[PDB]
A paper describes a structure:
CRISPR-Cas is a set of microbial adaptive immune systems characterized by the insertion of short viral- or plasmid-derived DNA fragments called spacers into the CRISPR regions in the microbe’s chromosome. However, the type II-A CRISPR-Cas systems of Streptococcus thermophilus and Streptococcus pyogenes encode four Cas proteins: Cas9; Cas1; Cas2; and Csn2, all of which are essential for adaptation in vivo (Heler et al., 2015, Wei et al., 2015). We show that the Cas9, Cas1, Cas2, and Csn2 proteins of a Streptococcus thermophilus type II-A CRISPR-Cas system form a complex and provide cryoelectron microscopy (cryo-EM) structures of three different assemblies. The structures we present here shed light on the initial stages of spacer capture and reveal an unprecedented higher order assembly of Cas1-Cas2-Csn2 proteins that appears to play a role in this process.
In addition to the monomer complexes, a fraction of the Cas1-Cas2-Csn2 particles formed larger complexes: one formed discrete particles that were larger than the monomer complexes and the other was filamentous. A structure for the larger discrete particles was obtained at 7.2-Å resolution. These particles contain two sets of the Cas18-Cas24-Csn28 minimal complex bridged by a pair of Cas14-Cas22 subcomplexes, with the protein components again related by D2 symmetry. One form contains two of the monomer particles with an additional interface comprising a further four Cas1 dimers and two Cas2 dimers. This “dimer” complex (Cas124-Cas212-Csn216) contains two fragments of duplex DNA running through the center, and the additional pair of Cas2 dimers caps the ends of this DNA. In the dimeric state, the additional Cas1 dimers dock at a site at the hinge between the Csn2 head and tail domains that is very different to the sites bound by the Cas1 subunits in the monomer. The same region of both Cas1 N-terminal domains (NTDs) in the dimer is located at the binding site but with a different site on Csn2. The alternate binding mode in the dimeric form does not induce any significant conformational changes within the monomer complexes, which, at this resolution, are unchanged relative to the free monomer. Duplex DNA is bound along a central channel but with two sections of DNA, each of ∼30 bp, bound within the two monomers. The larger Cas1-Cas2-Csn2 “dimer” assembly shows that additional Cas1-Cas2 subcomplexes can dock between a pair of the Cas18-Cas24-Csn28 complexes and are able to access the ends of the centrally bound DNA via the Cas2 dimers. Despite the medium resolution of the dimeric Cas1-Cas2-Csn2 structure, it is clear that the conformation of the middle Cas2 dimers in our structure is more similar to that in SpCas2 (Ka et al., 2018) but differs to that in other Cas2 structures and in the Cas1-Cas2 integration complexes.
Author numbering:
A (entry chain D), G (entry chain H): 1 to 219
B (entry chain P), E (entry chain O): 3 to 289
C (entry chain Q), D (entry chain T): 6 to 90, 100 to 110
F (entry chain C): 1 to 218
H (entry chain E): 74 to 146
Write the structure that this text describes.
């Protein structure tokens, strides 16, 4: 997952988490505007190993952390499917749940037989039980750090998003929290690209000087 | 190259696909190297790559680096411009003092004659007649110093008796600026010829790297003196711009009307060929 | 609304040339000015006069004639660059 | 930036016609589409590509050739309307 | 200054608070301006700033640029306050023929002695004894041509009687490759000394522009022919890979075991200082 | 208007443009959390000149400038209602609009009667004409400097919002652009408060030290 | 790009080049059979960061290096497009080629006008010139190392292949050649997985003991 | 068959003039040198054969005019 712009000499590769610091406010604002307008502008080009350019629908752009909606129909559906798989991996728990919903089905069936009208039904499944429970992620009481962590957790659930990009999101988190975010990103394998005006101390990042020189920086 | 590119703005320069790449935050522009003759950096905020410097050395393009005051600081000199340089060094060591003093005397005669032509175009009969008398009185070894007297009477007649070459005024500053630019172009031409620039054709005691290029650039000084005389009332910035207009303007060579760079290149070629052939023909440049 | 209008048609036949002269005279009578050959423009007061002018232009278009119409702002009209068919000193920086 | 381009030139001489064909082929190779004769347009990505295109068009302009360049918005470029064609005596028949 | 700063890696250079900032991907180093003496750029990926170039003009430090081949191409020439190397070139123009013949004869004697010693290490006593006899028979002006006679014996001993330098083969191309690398190193050292490489120690042939460095690198030539003899069966690519390890390998100088760069540097410095001082001591290198 | 939290000794007043710098990352992130949770959490308070607490509906919190849509259902509703009020203030113009709408309805009604299929219609209204025309604020923004200006225009247009708050939005704009934004805020009289992790040089701002003490700057 | 089988405790990630050494011949042959039959068998599961299982059409399996055909219609077509892009990046060369093609078209057009029949044509393009030249990769005289290198070069040209896998291909290459293959794979960013019965000395690899224990090995 | 006889006819007409065919061979040699240089610049090995006049005619698409307004034409 390499990104390239006219200011760079060679296309830079983005693997796992990547912290890109732009020391020039003009090039930073122009790059962010090229991130929002990316479908319209040909200056910023992001391509994969196949050299194929990714569509703006495949690109995931995030600026406001707490304003973004983490709960979507696809995210909640795939999450319910993941929970159903977790319950399916354990035979004993699945057997017990089958017994409980089974007994409930017996009761409701008796109540239906007591009625004068002829009533038919099918089944009460686990996905219907989860949908009836209303399982969803809670962003209401979550701190910004837990919000970005939940975004990194649900990025695997998003199928269409090729790369996640954060705009000036590293100013809220402490150095240790940034270390946790990067260390978790290395395990999640997702491609995250952070854009900050000022460099963060203690983490590996790519620095773009006002001279338009891109250099790797350990601190 | 036909084109003099001057960069006074902060930006980054790269070399891509035989093309000079000017990259800035506001805009980016690509200029081919074959069209570019001279590259001038007028500010200290410009960035460049050593690969572009190597491509400029292979393209034989003069690179000039100025100071924060915009005055030229240091220019790039390639070690080997052509393979004929190593063979020309033996000829330069084999040169004779009679050929050096003869060619230098003829060049000084061309410079004084050009000054008399400038004063004649300026309609000064006594001054151009006196400078012409010094031209007819020029001799080998220069015992009478008629060249320095011609310069003193030239500047003292043009700018007034109270004027002097040792003054710090913007007139002498623009004169040294034009002499530095023409000295840079002539020095680059001498680098193209391959002969040693530090060896002069007049005084073997004076040791300077610009001596030879100055001796070759002596006849062209009045061209700078004209624009300096016309723009002397204007500010030093406008005088510098008018000095930059000399590269765009064309001058009439004895053969035909040519650009300044072509006249300097062909003139230096005829001078080197005349030095190696021991004065076969002396190129003469007139205003 | 600045109305830019391009006009063309095969001119070979005499009837086609006469129709071209008639259409050009009609464009001049309607307030359009010819910047160059086939290039014209007119300043329409509002969208109403623009629509009526579009209908009139469709009615007055000669046989085989072709008209291109574009809506342009004053800032875009002042930016119009007409080139009718090599610099020694190139300056990148302040132009002095 | 939507670039509207008009192109005209005297076509009488054979060299002029050859130059017109060469310039038209150059316009087609650069991405310009001909809506009608002398009428062309091309979508430029930004202002830099527009300036470079202006310089290239000035360099490729044939002798006596005349080019009119106008900037129009993409939405205004879609607003382009192409019309392709009061008499007392109407004659349907031989025109006498 | 004293320390000679050379940049062989990709990096950027800046100037802040009278401090040169060198930035590489691994680490950042800041060097005081007064400590630096000569600055050389080995590769084409180095990035520099014109402000640092102006500070170097005020500091008089010599700036050397190199191409992808590592051969020095251009150097920075200031208009005023020139470096002392330009004053040192005049002594190179003043080099006497007796000193040049003495240093050349000593170099040929060192190369032939290294060839005979290498043949002794290869356990050929007749060929090494013959080359040693030619070494003891070498004389000034080279009437015997014992070097060209020792050549055929050395190559015929190494690669066989059928092998020759004129034939086109991966062995000859490998020898020209190793001689190209050694010519790049010795040429870079001569450029560091400031002496013009066009002036050679051999008075017969001025054709090559590298003649000085090509004459200085002769005593180290057999070290390449050893690896070329061991790897002769391998393809030219593998021979290039083996010859690329000579920079990492350490060799025994007369004083102490050192890297090839420092050995060539000390040898070149002793050669230049001996030529300017007219033969105080001749650096001797033995395998 | 004034804002008050447990960290400050006394509530600080926010008038026209205001720049607030928080030198503690924990207090900054917790402060933004208190901004988004302001309805849920009672820690952060805002007291106007009337010394009355304001609901979160009256507080306008904008973090991403480019990601904030200028066109919304409520904004278009208030704009269409405003244009309808302006057209209702002039009886003659609205009468002419009713006449033209009557003519168009007569033409379309005649064409409907010409058809063989029965057609039923109701009427055409000025609101349906505005919504049919698609009246909306200009969506063209070249840079974030212009987008923030449009946000200030729509904020000054909205009467219900008593305060506009930007979180780390000053890092995109240059110092000169910050001066133009402050001058435009002083000319528009609107109340704008900025939250930055680090201090900005050259402009007047309130610096909150890690010691929790608040000090004025420039 | 993580691969997982029943023998592994956790799914192992494959990034750039990866050397997997199976010390047990039974598990190695069974794993290779599961690689050829992968669509039929559910034991071996390869999934990306999205956890989506890749189809066998997306998987590229290679055993015989010299027997594989590197020249295909899609590979040659995309290669010709790449050459056309390389010629398009240089304005001067494209201008010269356009001039020559213009001359040839003038000659052929004159010959067409000389004929009695009315003849029409269109153009001679650069892609048609390359197709007429017959540009293709030469595997005839290529050594096995150059063949695998050309396969790593054309893997970027293949759009549908998600991951390239080699079966016992490291036995022919010398240690230095393996170092060149890995170092080139790090630059190409492609995902390559090698399967060898015996461990290779000097390169980082994952070793599977006869005890079925997977351990990282530096040498 | 019609395009085969037409292309063969044009090839015969070009073969009747040695100088014109020589110039065509020179231009084809230049284009082959340029494309060959671009192929050598690429990192992947490339093998080519040659370019022929028949492949140039077929690449140009020489054919009889397909424009017919009416059945009379
Ligand atoms: Ca159900
Ligand atoms: Ca519920
Ligand atoms: Ca062929
Ligand atoms: Ca074709």
């Amino acid at each position: 997952m390499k990104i390239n712009f006219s200011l760079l000499d060679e296309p830079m590769e983005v693997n796992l988490g990547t912290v890109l610091v732009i020391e020039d406010v003009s090039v930073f604002a122009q790059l962010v505007k090229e991130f929002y307008q990316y479908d319209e502008q040909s200056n910023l080009t992001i391509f994969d190993s196949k050299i194929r350019s990714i569509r703006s629908s495949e690109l995931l752009l995030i600026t406001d952390i707490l304003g973004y909606d983490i709960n979507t129909s696809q995210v909640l559906k795939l999450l319910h499917t993941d929970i159903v798989s977790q319950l399916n991996d354990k035979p004993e728990v699945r057997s017990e749940i089958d017994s409980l919903v089974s007994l409930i089905t017996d009761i409701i069936m008796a109540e239906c037989i007591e009625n004068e009208l002829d009533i038919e039904y099918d089944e009460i499944t686990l996905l219907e039980l989860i949908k009836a429970l209303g399982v969803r992620i809670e962003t209401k009481s979550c701190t910004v750090f837990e919000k970005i962590f939940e975004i990194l957790q649900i990025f695997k659930y998003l199928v269409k998003k090729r790369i996640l990009v954060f705009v000036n999101s590293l100013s809220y988190f402490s150095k240790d929290e940034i270390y946790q975010i990067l260390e978790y990103t290395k395990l999640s394998q997702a491609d995250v690209l952070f854009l900050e005006p000022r460099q963060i101390e203690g983490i590996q990042q790519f620095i773009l000087d006002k001279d338009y020189i891109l250099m790797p920086y350990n601190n | 190259g036909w084109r003099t590119v001057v960069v006074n703005i902060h930006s980054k320069l790269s070399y891509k696909n035989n093309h000079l790449i000017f990259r800035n935050s506001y805009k980016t522009e690509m200029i081919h190297l074959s069209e570019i003759d001279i590259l001038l950096l007028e500010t200290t905020d410009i960035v460049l790559t050593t690969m572009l410097v190597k491509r400029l050395v292979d393209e034989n393009i003069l690179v000039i680096f100025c100071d924060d005051k915009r005055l030229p600081t240091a220019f790039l000199t390639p070690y080997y411009a052509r393979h004929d340089s190593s063979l020309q060094i033996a000829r330069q060591i084999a040169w004779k003092e009679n050929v050096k003093c003869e060619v230098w005397t003829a060049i000084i005669a061309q410079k004084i004659l050009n000054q008399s032509y400038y004063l004649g175009e300026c309609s000064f009969f006594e001054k151009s007649q006196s400078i012409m008398e010094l031209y007819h009185g020029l001799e080998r070894f220069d015992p009478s110093n008629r060249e320095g007297h011609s310069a003193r009477i030239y500047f003292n007649t043009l700018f007034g008796n109270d004027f002097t070459r040792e003054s710090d005024n913007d007139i002498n500053a623009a004169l040294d600026y034009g002499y530095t630019l023409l000295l840079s172009m002539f020095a680059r031409e001498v680098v193209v010829c391959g002969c040693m620039t530090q060896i002069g054709l007049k005084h073997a005691n004076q040791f300077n790297q610009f001596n030879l290029a100055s001796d070759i650039m002596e006849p062209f000084r009045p061209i700078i003196d004209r624009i300096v005389y016309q723009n002397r009332h204007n500010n030093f910035v406008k005088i510098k711009k008018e000095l930059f207009s000399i590269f765009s303007e064309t001058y009439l060579y004895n053969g035909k009307e040519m650009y300044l760079s072509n006249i300097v290149s062909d003139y230096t070629k005829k001078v080197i060929k005349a030095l190696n052939q021991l004065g076969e023909e002396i190129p003469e440049f007139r205003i | 609304m600045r109305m830019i209008l391009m006009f063309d048609m095969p001119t070979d036949t005499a009837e086609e040339r006469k129709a071209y002269r008639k259409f050009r005279k009609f464009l001049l009578s309607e307030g359009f000015i010819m910047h160059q050959f086939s290039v014209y423009s007119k300043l329409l007061l509002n969208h109403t006069a623009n629509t009526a002018m579009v209908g009139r232009l469709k009615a007055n278009n000669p046989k085989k004639g072709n008209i291109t119409i574009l809506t342009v702002t004053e800032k875009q009209f002042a930016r119009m660059i007409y080139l009718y068919g090599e610099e020694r000193l190139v300056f990148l920086g302040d132009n002095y």
